[PDB]
């Protein structure tokens, strides 16, 4: 009937802020299409297979990284810029950690570890 | 992955490509000084190297004693043009400003500065077959000019994935689609749209050209967001035409993407997510109604890895 | 998240809906049921049928957003209609309601209504819902209607744009109209005409998209077209590639669909449908389940005809 | 003389069509059935499905009467039209087709063609039949089609009007049409539309009629009309009461179908639609049955709509 279409290198490696897009259904299987009732309708079904997709999966399923580079050029006084990360994930992505190297008198306030 | 240099003629270009496709573990049937016989799990190519200008032909089968245009299965004889003429991409003579090179192991993507502002595509690949059970899949394509000083986007002048040109002789690409309509297996079907032809297939190649044929060029168009200055990347979608004119989606261009470059200087990095990705222009720098003497803002996205 | 079956009248569908809405396992156990803020009928119905309104909160998937949404049940025995009207907003609050009048005003930056068409009999329906977006299909038995409303798909943070909210019917809301209407202007999510679909500009000023030119339509709304069915603009001849779609080798591709407006001041991509694409008609038609990657889509087609490029798929998940 | 049921295909339904006309019990008993004095597959397919053709005849319930009928079976694959040709005659002579050409031409009193629109997947359909006169009705998803042919009721002797035969199909013969069609001319038999319903005058001229004109059409036909769907002819208001009509109190009223031509020569009374009736759409619709004096009736919608004057109702007996 159906099993697969693909799709999995090019929306995982797509100009995405996000990833892993649509990965899970993958596992999650599953499947009753065939099957037909007549509610006079008509009795119409042909093969009935997989292709194709959306082709517009984009941005869908994980972290953003909003900033790429900073340009803190010449500092003088106390500055504060804003990081946000936005997770489309139905389940939280736990972050393992912050290894802070070289990153000495820079500080998160009002945030947990 | 990503490679960069300089050639003062186009054997130089030859020879590092076919340097680094072999460190790729690439298998060449043959090699020359100009002409080429090579192949991949996927499917069979064969190059040669003009004066000023690419010669490129698919191929199904090999034999070392014919000519590089006579190889089995050739697209010279193959293909619904009368002409009967193989792909071509036009360069020009001398100094090549700067090439960048994508290599896979499925396909090799080319973009050669030949001059400050000018650049010249070079497409080899296989199409991802997105889970469609079909035979084939392999698209070479070239870069030609119409006339130098005149409008150099002229209707009659052909590009990568071209969906409306004219001409009679040559054709900038091309795509395999094997027994089509129940004909014989080796079938080379060109980018064409005025032949008429049962069978042909289009592409989104000229970007977003007024009398461009296909329904994504308001993407293309509207790839820029004025409101965050953000900017998406639309899969190239092929189409072919079956004998009586119905259409079936054949697939995609793997690790490619084109876009408005409005907002874009030639080389600008936005890199969207875990992948970067690399925007160049497709012949030169212009402005947005510029269709006849410059590619307008239509830009080529290539996955960085 | 989808309840397929056959609802004995239009209060009956309207009480099922809810009841899925309130009390589906899938929304129970994840927690993204909907929350009645309103519930009332306050016309009193002559010659007519009576008139339920209900307004319902989402949560959304988070359940950090805000979504606000309306249903009203209009009908008229004296003409047999009993259309559903629907409609989007904000917030709301009951005491901003005028004497009299109807509190759908009282919404804030509130959008004009659509509608689907049905009346008082036993009618196959087809449901789909989500955290974001809800999806109504009933099928008239030899026609089919569609309509919905949700929250898009953009490509742009929601920290900037947290409600890209859109609404889509049948018809146009402002008038009553007969379910055997033989306008072009009753068609189905796929193709809007004749004020059929409704989204919010992230400046707050909700912006009409129509695949078609209409003269009676606003100037403002021609150039902002759903581009997948409005490939008219480029091409230079009525027939193209879109209408003439096929199935490949037994293979039905999926074409999702695209918000896009193309206006002077600027352009600007807006996003996509959320389980509804484009696919052809050939060998296939209605009530046909496609899979994909495990995942199963319904085929619909338009009121108006069953033509190629007036037939859409709508993920059931 | 009626059957129900699921055909696989078209060419299964022209099968079972066949198998209805010989072995029907009541046909064999009373001894109605029809004679095949034809049936062969003349072209050679290509890219297109087996053509089959074939010519009966129909002796009449008095064994007295005189009727020739063909069927044909055109279809291609590429653009997926099954289609299934009907026409009419007096005579037929196998010899007299052309190297080539068709044998439609041979037919004594040869008409234009009707049809009817299908596609090889199984299909329901409803088969009417009788020694005078046979009604055939297909539905197609969303689409309710339906065509037949026979002898009409005059209220003259039948010794000097011995061949009041008539053709009905859903759209013309002379092209080829795909079922999705979106174009007026294709409808139902009640209301005829550009030569969609042909009768035999008793001056053997076969006489088109159409409810409403058409500068396509020839200027003879205009004034020639089906008056029950045509009341615009002497009404002031495009609003009239037929297009308003309503049961009463529960009882669906039938309305025979009127065939009467009035041209400046003079006027003439031809006969009525014999189990095929005028019926509202309210509260009803297709594949409803509704039981007058003992005798009970089918109601179907045409192509185009369902809309009142879009609407008609067949005997079932």
Known sequence: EGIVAGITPNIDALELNQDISLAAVAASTWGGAYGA??????????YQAVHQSALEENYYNRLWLIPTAMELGNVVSTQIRPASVWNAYFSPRTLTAIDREAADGITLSGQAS | ???????????????????????????????????????????????????????????????????????????????????????????????????????????????????????????????????????????????????????????????????????????????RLDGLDGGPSPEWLPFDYTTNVPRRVVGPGRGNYSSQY???????????????????????????????????????????????????????????????????????????????????????????? | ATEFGTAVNHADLVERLVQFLTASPDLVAAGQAYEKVFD?????????????????????????????????????????????????????????????????????????????????????????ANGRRFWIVVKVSTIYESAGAGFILPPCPPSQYPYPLAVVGSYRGDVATRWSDVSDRHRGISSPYERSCYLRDPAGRWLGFTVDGGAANESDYNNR?????????YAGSSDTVVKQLRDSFGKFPLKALQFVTRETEGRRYLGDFDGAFYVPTLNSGAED????????????????????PWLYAIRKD
């Open chain 3, 289 to 308: 389940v496609i899979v994909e990657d495990g995942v199963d889509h319904v085929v619909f087609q338009t009121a108006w005809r069953s033509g190629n």
């Open chain 3, 225 to 233: 077209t759903l581009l997948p069915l409005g490939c008219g603009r």
């Open chain 2, 214 to 305: 296909h329904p994504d060029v308001g993407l293309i168009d509207a790839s820029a967001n004025e409101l965050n200055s953000s900017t998406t990347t639309v899969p190239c979608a092929i189409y072919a035409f079956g004998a009586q004119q119905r259409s079936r989606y054949v697939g995609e261009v793997p690790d490619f993407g084109i876009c408005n470059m409005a907002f874009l200087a030639p080389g600008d990095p936005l890199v969207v997510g875990s992948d970067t990705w690399r925007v160049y222009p497709l012949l030169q720098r212009g402005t947005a109604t510029d269709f006849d003497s410059t590619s307008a803002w239509v830009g080529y996205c290539f996955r960085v890895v």
């Open chain 2, 1 to 175: 992955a990503y490679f960069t240099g300089t050639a003062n003629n186009p054997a130089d270009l030859l020879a590092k490509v076919r340097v680094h496709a072999e460190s790729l573990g690439w298998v060449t049937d043959r090699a020359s000084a100009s002409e080429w016989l090579c192949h991949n799990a996927d499917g069979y190519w064969s190059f040669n190297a003009g004066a000023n200008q690419f010669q490129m032909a698919g191929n199904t089968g090999f034999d070392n004693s014919l000519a590089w245009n006579a190889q089995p299965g050739n697209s010279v004889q193959n293909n619904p043009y009368s002409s009967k003429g193989p792909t071509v991409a036009q360069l020009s003579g001398g100094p090549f400003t700067r090439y960048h090179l994508f290599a896979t192991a499925a396909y090799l993507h080319l973009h050669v500065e030949i001059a400050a502002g000018q650049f010249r595509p070079v497409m080899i690949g296989s199409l991802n077959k997105r889970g469609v059970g079909y035979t084939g899949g392999q698209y070479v394509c070239g870069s030609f000019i119409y006339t130098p000083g005149q409008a150099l986007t002229n209707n009659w002048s052909s590009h990568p994935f071209d969906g409306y040109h004219i001409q009679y002789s040559n054709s900038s690409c091309m795509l």
């Open chain 3, 40 to 128: 009332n009928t306050i016309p009193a119905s002559g010659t007519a049928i009576a008139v339920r309104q209900v307004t319902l909160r989402a949560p959304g998937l988070g359940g950090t957003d805000a979504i606000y949404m309306g249903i009203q049940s209009y009908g008229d025995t004296a003409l047999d209609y009993y259309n559903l009207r629907l409609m989007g907003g904000t917030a709301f609050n009951p005491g901003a309601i005028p004497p009299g009048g109807d509190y759908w005003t009282a919404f804030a930056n509130y959008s004009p209504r659509v509608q689907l068409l049905a009346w008082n009999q036993p009618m196959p329906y087809w449901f789909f």
């Open chain 1, 37 to 46: 009732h007549q509610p006079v309708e008509v009795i119409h079904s042909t």
